[PDB]
Amino acid sequence: KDTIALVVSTLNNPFFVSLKDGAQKEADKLGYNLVVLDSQNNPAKELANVQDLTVRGVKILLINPVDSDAVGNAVKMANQANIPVITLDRQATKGEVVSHIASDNVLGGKIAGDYIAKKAGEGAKVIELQGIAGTSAARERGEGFQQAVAAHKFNVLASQPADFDRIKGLNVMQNLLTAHPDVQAVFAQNDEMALGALRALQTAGKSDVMVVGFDGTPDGEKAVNDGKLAATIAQLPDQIGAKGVEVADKVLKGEKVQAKYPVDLKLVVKQ
Ligand SMILES: O[C@@H]1[C@H](O)[C@H](O)CO[C@H]1O
């Protein structure tokens, strides 16, 4: 079997476990060996892993950067080895990349803000919990949300990163609530942060504050159905993973591959 490598930012997040599962299923179907290396949200690890894979002479690198700015040197190493690179979910700011497969995260952030305007109103007092700085996902969601802040004249009380992490989201939101008890709505750039924020708000007696997440993870979907999470923006991580392999196969066969394969997003609310 030929080997495709998948270098994933972390497997401590259900979104990325699903991404890996889609890649694996597709690899199995197309007859490739898939080597999955977990970067553990660590730029040093990501670099070591890519170096290892380039010396193993993998045929294609699928990479979900830890940091879109920091991954340039890892990608240049694959470039020097003539191993084509396909980015999944997050972009590489520098380096040669054959194809990028991700959600329209600008649109996602706009959709999230637009729903907050629908339910909390024009001029709502909002807090944004940002993802990992340096990731195109967080940057784009922030851009999309700012479009909503402008459109609907939101009062942004605070916008701070909680690193796509549930516990950080809890600690950051707890902290922000003390400064800004008048918050009316929160946009958390993933469901893990959203669920942390929800826990901080319940603790402070502010469970009336509307929260919108991102990803539509099983825990996000459950939280919507339970009435705790106002909404989430559903992504299709299995499809991002699968497409990565499908395009890797294409590249290897010399077929023409798009520079970008956008993957659909969907506002999810309780039915
Ligand atoms: O798209 C992904 C998901 O939102 C994940 O939960 C965090 O990283 C982003 O890049």
Side-chain angles (χ1 to χ4, degrees), residues 9 13 15-16 64 89-90 103 105 132 135 137-138 141 164 189-192 214-215 217 235 240:
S9 60
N13 178 346
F15 177 91
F16 290 112
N64 169 242
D89 174 70
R90 304 158 178 183
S103 294
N105 287 307
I132 295 163
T135 72
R141 289 171 199 166
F164 286 141
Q189 291 178 4
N190 81 343
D191 285 340
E192 290 299 311
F214 211 103
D215 285 351
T217 55
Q235 297 198 80
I240 293 163

mmCIF file of all heavy atoms in Angstrom, residues 9 13 15-16 64 89-90 103 105 132 135 137-138 141 164 189-192 214-215 217 235 240, ligand 1:
data_model
loop_
_atom_site.group_PDB
_atom_site.id
_atom_site.type_symbol
_atom_site.label_atom_id
_atom_site.label_comp_id
_atom_site.label_asym_id
_atom_site.label_seq_id
_atom_site.Cartn_x
_atom_site.Cartn_y
_atom_site.Cartn_z
ATOM 1 N N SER A 9 -4.130 18.771 14.103
ATOM 2 C CA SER A 9 -3.731 19.710 15.155
ATOM 3 C C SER A 9 -3.843 19.098 16.559
ATOM 4 O O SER A 9 -2.962 19.293 17.398
ATOM 5 C CB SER A 9 -4.554 20.993 15.080
ATOM 6 O OG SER A 9 -5.928 20.717 15.229
ATOM 7 N N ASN A 13 -10.272 16.940 20.681
ATOM 8 C CA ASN A 13 -11.477 17.647 20.293
ATOM 9 C C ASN A 13 -12.297 16.715 19.382
ATOM 10 O O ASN A 13 -11.778 16.254 18.376
ATOM 11 C CB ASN A 13 -11.023 18.923 19.561
ATOM 12 C CG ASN A 13 -12.164 19.765 19.042
ATOM 13 O OD1 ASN A 13 -13.310 19.333 18.966
ATOM 14 N ND2 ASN A 13 -11.845 20.988 18.670
ATOM 15 N N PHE A 15 -14.463 17.197 17.071
ATOM 16 C CA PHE A 15 -14.438 17.633 15.679
ATOM 17 C C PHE A 15 -13.270 16.975 14.922
ATOM 18 O O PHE A 15 -13.451 16.486 13.790
ATOM 19 C CB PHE A 15 -14.361 19.158 15.602
ATOM 20 C CG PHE A 15 -14.254 19.690 14.206
ATOM 21 C CD1 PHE A 15 -15.391 20.012 13.483
ATOM 22 C CD2 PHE A 15 -13.005 19.863 13.609
ATOM 23 C CE1 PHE A 15 -15.287 20.492 12.196
ATOM 24 C CE2 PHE A 15 -12.898 20.342 12.346
ATOM 25 C CZ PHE A 15 -14.051 20.662 11.623
ATOM 26 N N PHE A 16 -12.093 16.934 15.552
ATOM 27 C CA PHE A 16 -10.912 16.392 14.884
ATOM 28 C C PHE A 16 -10.875 14.865 14.870
ATOM 29 O O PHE A 16 -10.396 14.276 13.918
ATOM 30 C CB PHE A 16 -9.618 17.020 15.395
ATOM 31 C CG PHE A 16 -9.461 18.453 14.978
ATOM 32 C CD1 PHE A 16 -9.506 19.486 15.913
ATOM 33 C CD2 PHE A 16 -9.321 18.777 13.666
ATOM 34 C CE1 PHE A 16 -9.376 20.814 15.512
ATOM 35 C CE2 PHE A 16 -9.224 20.125 13.254
ATOM 36 C CZ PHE A 16 -9.239 21.132 14.198
ATOM 37 N N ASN A 64 -3.616 19.640 9.018
ATOM 38 C CA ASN A 64 -4.467 20.591 9.727
ATOM 39 C C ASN A 64 -3.544 21.394 10.669
ATOM 40 O O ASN A 64 -3.221 20.925 11.747
ATOM 41 C CB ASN A 64 -5.554 19.806 10.468
ATOM 42 C CG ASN A 64 -6.335 20.637 11.455
ATOM 43 O OD1 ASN A 64 -6.312 20.349 12.641
ATOM 44 N ND2 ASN A 64 -7.007 21.668 10.988
ATOM 45 N N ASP A 89 -9.160 22.159 6.874
ATOM 46 C CA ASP A 89 -9.837 22.934 7.957
ATOM 47 C C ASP A 89 -9.179 24.287 8.281
ATOM 48 O O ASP A 89 -9.890 25.281 8.491
ATOM 49 C CB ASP A 89 -10.074 22.046 9.217
ATOM 50 C CG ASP A 89 -10.638 22.824 10.398
ATOM 51 O OD1 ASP A 89 -11.833 23.240 10.339
ATOM 52 O OD2 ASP A 89 -9.867 22.983 11.386
ATOM 53 N N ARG A 90 -7.837 24.326 8.296
ATOM 54 C CA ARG A 90 -7.064 25.550 8.494
ATOM 55 C C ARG A 90 -6.001 25.683 7.408
ATOM 56 O O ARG A 90 -5.406 24.699 6.982
ATOM 57 C CB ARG A 90 -6.381 25.589 9.864
ATOM 58 C CG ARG A 90 -7.298 25.435 11.058
ATOM 59 C CD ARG A 90 -6.511 24.952 12.242
ATOM 60 N NE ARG A 90 -7.325 24.821 13.446
ATOM 61 C CZ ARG A 90 -6.861 24.464 14.640
ATOM 62 N NH1 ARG A 90 -5.587 24.196 14.808
ATOM 63 N NH2 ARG A 90 -7.678 24.383 15.687
ATOM 64 N N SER A 103 -14.523 24.644 5.710
ATOM 65 C CA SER A 103 -15.754 25.451 5.725
ATOM 66 C C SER A 103 -15.530 26.921 5.323
ATOM 67 O O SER A 103 -14.399 27.412 5.346
ATOM 68 C CB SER A 103 -16.387 25.421 7.109
ATOM 69 O OG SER A 103 -16.829 24.134 7.406
ATOM 70 N N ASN A 105 -15.646 29.768 6.849
ATOM 71 C CA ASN A 105 -15.643 30.247 8.217
ATOM 72 C C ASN A 105 -16.000 31.727 8.393
ATOM 73 O O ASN A 105 -16.527 32.108 9.437
ATOM 74 C CB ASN A 105 -14.308 29.878 8.847
ATOM 75 C CG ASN A 105 -14.224 28.398 9.130
ATOM 76 O OD1 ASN A 105 -15.118 27.856 9.777
ATOM 77 N ND2 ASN A 105 -13.204 27.718 8.594
ATOM 78 N N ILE A 132 -8.083 29.528 18.736
ATOM 79 C CA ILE A 132 -6.630 29.622 18.837
ATOM 80 C C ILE A 132 -6.147 30.697 17.864
ATOM 81 O O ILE A 132 -6.436 30.638 16.664
ATOM 82 C CB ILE A 132 -5.965 28.247 18.531
ATOM 83 C CG1 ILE A 132 -6.353 27.228 19.585
ATOM 84 C CG2 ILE A 132 -4.430 28.363 18.425
ATOM 85 C CD1 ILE A 132 -6.091 25.797 19.169
ATOM 86 N N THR A 135 -4.788 30.711 13.918
ATOM 87 C CA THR A 135 -5.505 29.787 13.034
ATOM 88 C C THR A 135 -6.423 30.548 12.102
ATOM 89 O O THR A 135 -7.143 31.478 12.517
ATOM 90 C CB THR A 135 -6.339 28.691 13.765
ATOM 91 O OG1 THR A 135 -7.502 29.263 14.389
ATOM 92 C CG2 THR A 135 -5.512 27.912 14.769
ATOM 93 N N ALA A 137 -9.130 29.491 10.996
ATOM 94 C CA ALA A 137 -10.530 29.257 11.385
ATOM 95 C C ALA A 137 -11.012 30.367 12.327
ATOM 96 O O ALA A 137 -12.030 30.991 12.099
ATOM 97 C CB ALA A 137 -10.699 27.864 12.026
ATOM 98 N N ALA A 138 -10.241 30.629 13.358
ATOM 99 C CA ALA A 138 -10.570 31.653 14.349
ATOM 100 C C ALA A 138 -10.575 33.051 13.705
ATOM 101 O O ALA A 138 -11.503 33.812 13.901
ATOM 102 C CB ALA A 138 -9.584 31.579 15.504
ATOM 103 N N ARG A 141 -13.741 33.345 11.408
ATOM 104 C CA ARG A 141 -14.962 33.432 12.196
ATOM 105 C C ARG A 141 -15.071 34.814 12.829
ATOM 106 O O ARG A 141 -16.153 35.407 12.833
ATOM 107 C CB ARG A 141 -15.026 32.315 13.238
ATOM 108 C CG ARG A 141 -15.275 30.970 12.570
ATOM 109 C CD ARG A 141 -15.147 29.798 13.479
ATOM 110 N NE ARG A 141 -14.952 28.622 12.638
ATOM 111 C CZ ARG A 141 -14.537 27.447 13.072
ATOM 112 N NH1 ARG A 141 -14.332 27.265 14.375
ATOM 113 N NH2 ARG A 141 -14.352 26.454 12.213
ATOM 114 N N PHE A 164 -10.197 27.209 21.656
ATOM 115 C CA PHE A 164 -11.007 26.110 21.164
ATOM 116 C C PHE A 164 -11.162 25.017 22.231
ATOM 117 O O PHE A 164 -11.487 23.896 21.922
ATOM 118 C CB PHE A 164 -10.395 25.544 19.869
ATOM 119 C CG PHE A 164 -10.585 26.404 18.628
ATOM 120 C CD1 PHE A 164 -9.553 26.530 17.703
ATOM 121 C CD2 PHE A 164 -11.818 27.015 18.327
ATOM 122 C CE1 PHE A 164 -9.720 27.288 16.516
ATOM 123 C CE2 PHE A 164 -11.991 27.747 17.159
ATOM 124 C CZ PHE A 164 -10.941 27.889 16.252
ATOM 125 N N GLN A 189 -16.501 30.505 19.243
ATOM 126 C CA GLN A 189 -16.065 29.997 17.950
ATOM 127 C C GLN A 189 -15.897 28.473 17.823
ATOM 128 O O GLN A 189 -15.517 27.966 16.756
ATOM 129 C CB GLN A 189 -14.804 30.730 17.520
ATOM 130 C CG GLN A 189 -15.047 32.177 17.172
ATOM 131 C CD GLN A 189 -13.772 32.898 16.786
ATOM 132 O OE1 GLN A 189 -12.696 32.291 16.699
ATOM 133 N NE2 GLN A 189 -13.868 34.206 16.614
ATOM 134 N N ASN A 190 -16.184 27.731 18.882
ATOM 135 C CA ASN A 190 -16.478 26.306 18.744
ATOM 136 C C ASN A 190 -17.354 25.812 19.880
ATOM 137 O O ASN A 190 -17.586 26.531 20.877
ATOM 138 C CB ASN A 190 -15.215 25.426 18.501
ATOM 139 C CG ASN A 190 -14.440 25.093 19.766
ATOM 140 O OD1 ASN A 190 -14.603 25.740 20.809
ATOM 141 N ND2 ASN A 190 -13.580 24.060 19.678
ATOM 142 N N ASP A 191 -17.854 24.592 19.721
ATOM 143 C CA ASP A 191 -18.808 24.064 20.690
ATOM 144 C C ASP A 191 -18.172 23.788 22.058
ATOM 145 O O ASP A 191 -18.824 23.975 23.091
ATOM 146 C CB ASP A 191 -19.472 22.799 20.160
ATOM 147 C CG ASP A 191 -20.509 23.058 19.086
ATOM 148 O OD1 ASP A 191 -21.045 24.185 18.932
ATOM 149 O OD2 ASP A 191 -20.812 22.061 18.383
ATOM 150 N N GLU A 192 -16.903 23.394 22.072
ATOM 151 C CA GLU A 192 -16.183 23.150 23.337
ATOM 152 C C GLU A 192 -16.144 24.408 24.224
ATOM 153 O O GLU A 192 -16.512 24.362 25.404
ATOM 154 C CB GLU A 192 -14.771 22.655 23.051
ATOM 155 C CG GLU A 192 -14.687 21.247 22.471
ATOM 156 C CD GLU A 192 -15.251 20.218 23.407
ATOM 157 O OE1 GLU A 192 -14.885 20.218 24.600
ATOM 158 O OE2 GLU A 192 -16.078 19.408 22.969
ATOM 159 N N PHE A 214 -20.200 26.557 17.505
ATOM 160 C CA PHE A 214 -19.731 26.244 16.151
ATOM 161 C C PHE A 214 -19.254 24.799 16.169
ATOM 162 O O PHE A 214 -18.504 24.418 17.072
ATOM 163 C CB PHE A 214 -18.565 27.171 15.778
ATOM 164 C CG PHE A 214 -18.451 27.500 14.286
ATOM 165 C CD1 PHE A 214 -18.877 28.737 13.803
ATOM 166 C CD2 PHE A 214 -17.867 26.604 13.395
ATOM 167 C CE1 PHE A 214 -18.742 29.072 12.470
ATOM 168 C CE2 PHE A 214 -17.754 26.915 12.025
ATOM 169 C CZ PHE A 214 -18.172 28.152 11.569
ATOM 170 N N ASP A 215 -19.729 24.013 15.200
ATOM 171 C CA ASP A 215 -19.184 22.686 14.806
ATOM 172 C C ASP A 215 -20.323 21.690 14.644
ATOM 173 O O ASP A 215 -20.273 20.826 13.777
ATOM 174 C CB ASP A 215 -18.166 22.086 15.806
ATOM 175 C CG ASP A 215 -16.781 22.760 15.761
ATOM 176 O OD1 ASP A 215 -16.532 23.579 14.860
ATOM 177 O OD2 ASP A 215 -15.919 22.418 16.618
ATOM 178 N N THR A 217 -20.951 19.422 17.032
ATOM 179 C CA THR A 217 -20.432 18.170 17.594
ATOM 180 C C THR A 217 -21.604 17.452 18.285
ATOM 181 O O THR A 217 -22.644 18.052 18.512
ATOM 182 C CB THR A 217 -19.314 18.418 18.638
ATOM 183 O OG1 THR A 217 -19.799 19.302 19.651
ATOM 184 C CG2 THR A 217 -18.091 19.023 18.018
ATOM 185 N N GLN A 235 -20.694 21.961 11.017
ATOM 186 C CA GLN A 235 -19.669 21.660 10.025
ATOM 187 C C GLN A 235 -19.749 20.172 9.732
ATOM 188 O O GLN A 235 -20.486 19.437 10.411
ATOM 189 C CB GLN A 235 -18.291 21.999 10.552
ATOM 190 C CG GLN A 235 -18.010 23.467 10.868
ATOM 191 C CD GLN A 235 -16.521 23.723 10.957
ATOM 192 O OE1 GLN A 235 -15.847 23.876 9.938
ATOM 193 N NE2 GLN A 235 -15.988 23.699 12.176
ATOM 194 N N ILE A 240 -14.717 16.677 5.438
ATOM 195 C CA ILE A 240 -13.439 17.355 5.236
ATOM 196 C C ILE A 240 -12.307 16.308 5.179
ATOM 197 O O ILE A 240 -11.506 16.324 4.250
ATOM 198 C CB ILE A 240 -13.129 18.442 6.315
ATOM 199 C CG1 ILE A 240 -14.114 19.620 6.214
ATOM 200 C CG2 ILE A 240 -11.665 18.892 6.204
ATOM 201 C CD1 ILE A 240 -14.155 20.522 7.478
HETATM 202 O O1 LIG B 1 -13.006 23.998 12.381
HETATM 203 C C1 LIG B 1 -12.356 23.624 13.564
HETATM 204 C C2 LIG B 1 -13.359 23.322 14.677
HETATM 205 O O2 LIG B 1 -14.170 24.457 14.955
HETATM 206 C C3 LIG B 1 -12.584 22.850 15.903
HETATM 207 O O3 LIG B 1 -13.425 22.666 17.010
HETATM 208 C C4 LIG B 1 -11.554 23.900 16.281
HETATM 209 O O4 LIG B 1 -10.695 24.123 15.181
HETATM 210 C C5 LIG B 1 -11.326 24.643 14.036
HETATM 211 O O5 LIG B 1 -10.331 24.823 13.062
#
